[PDB]
């Protein structure tokens, strides 16, 4: 295990859904598919912040996620920075994010 | 911090192999494929460790690389600082590994 934060980010960054070349608002627009993951602008301004984005009938949505010092996954409300921790599903971090996103996507 | 972004540059790269954990899986990998080199998580607080492996004319060679919390690239020993060229870390690592291999193919 060691410092799980490093292992957790490996699962994310190696994944095909992670887009290391999408760094701005309209590059997300140009792009839009179940979703994409990308490096959050919040990292440059505790956690490592990952942003998730998807297109539904309503338009493009985003979810901010946080991972702390020893790899616990959190959902983050951008209005108040209220944290909601997420269990890692048996199949791994990406399986956890994938379910959290595509269901919110139908919940929409 | 800067180390999370260095990891990101490393883990998103084509040469990083998340499913190669052991010395056996490395030998198994290079038994067939012609990749110039691969990056992988090393078996190894102050250092996050990244292992490079390539096949030369004499066998399987490795380099262990280290990255501290400051995002600085350290190649290990039996240390020397590496500065990130223009064009970034993978362009750097690509040069450091591929020149070590080319060194060998001229020495042996």
Q: What residue spans define the domains of chain B?
A: 1-108
Contact between B81 and B72 under an 8 Å Cβ cutoff? The reply is: yes
User: At A82, which helix (H) or strand (E)?
Assistant: strand A82-86
- Cross-strand pairs, B96: none
Cβ-based neighbour number of residue B7 at 10 Å: 22
Furthest CA-CA distance within chain B: 41
Backbone angles phi, psi at A10, to 5 degrees: -60, -50
Furthest CA-CA distance within chain A: 42
Backbone angles phi, psi at B70, to 5 degrees: -90, -5
For residues A41 and A60, give the distance between their C-alpha atoms in angstroms, rounded to a whole number.
Answer: 17
To 10 degrees, what angle do helices A4-13 and B2-11 make? 40
Please name the residues in contact with A95: beta carbons below 8 A apart, sequence gap of 6 or more. Answer: A89
- Region of A22 (left: φ > 0; alpha: ψ -120 to 50; beta: rest) is beta
Pairwise CB contact (< 8 Å): B8 & A6: no
Smallest CA-to-CA distance from B10 within B92, B83, B78, B82 is with B92
b/e A66-97 (16+ beta carbons within 10 angstroms → b): bbbeebbbbbbeeeeeeeeebebeeeebbebb
User: At A65, which helix (H) or strand (E)?
Assistant: strand A59-68
For residues B38 and A33, give the distance between their C-alpha atoms in angstroms, rounded to a whole number.
Answer: 30
State how far residue B53 is from chain A, nearest Cα, in angstroms: 18
For residues A52 and A72, give the distance between their C-alpha atoms in angstroms, rounded to a whole number.
Answer: 17
**DSSP secondary structure string for all residues of B57-106:** SSSEEEEEEEE-TT--EEE----EEE---TT-HHHHHHHHHHHHHHHHHH
DSSP conformational letter for A87 = P
**Solved using:** X-ray
State how far residue B54 is from chain A, nearest Cα, in angstroms: 20
Q: What's this structure's resolution in Å?
A: 2.0
- Region of A85 (left: φ > 0; alpha: ψ -120 to 50; beta: rest) is beta
Pairwise CB contact (< 8 Å): B7 & A20: no
Backbone angles phi, psi at A89, to 5 degrees: -65, 160
User: Residues 36..95 of B with a Cβ closer than 8 Å to A: which?
Assistant: 41, 48
Helical segments of chain A, H only: 4-13, 25-31, 93-107
Report CA-CA distances (Å) from A27 to A20, A44, B35: 11, 18, 32
Smallest CA-to-CA distance from A8 within B21, B8, B43 is with B8
Smallest CA-to-CA distance from B96 within B77, B74, B78 is with B74
Q: Which is it for strands B73-75 and B80-82: parallel, antiparallel or unpaired?
A: antiparallel
Smallest CA-to-CA distance from B53 within B25, B72, B12, B78 is with B25
């Amino acid at each position: 295990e060691s410092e799980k934060i490093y292992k957790v980010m490996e699962e994310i960054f190696v994944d095909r859904h992670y887009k290391e070349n999408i760094r701005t608002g309209e590059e997300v627009k140009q792009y839009f598919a179940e979703f994409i993951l990308r490096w959050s602008s919040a990292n440059e301004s505790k956690y490592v912040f990952i942003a998730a984005s998807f297109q539904a009938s309503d338009g493009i949505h985003s979810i901010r996620y946080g991972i702390n010092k020893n790899g616990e996954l959190f959902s983050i409300n951008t209005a108040s920075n209220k944290v909601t921790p997420i269990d890692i599903l048996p199949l791994g971090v990406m399986a956890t994010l994938t379910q959290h996103i595509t269901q919110n996507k139908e919940l929409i």
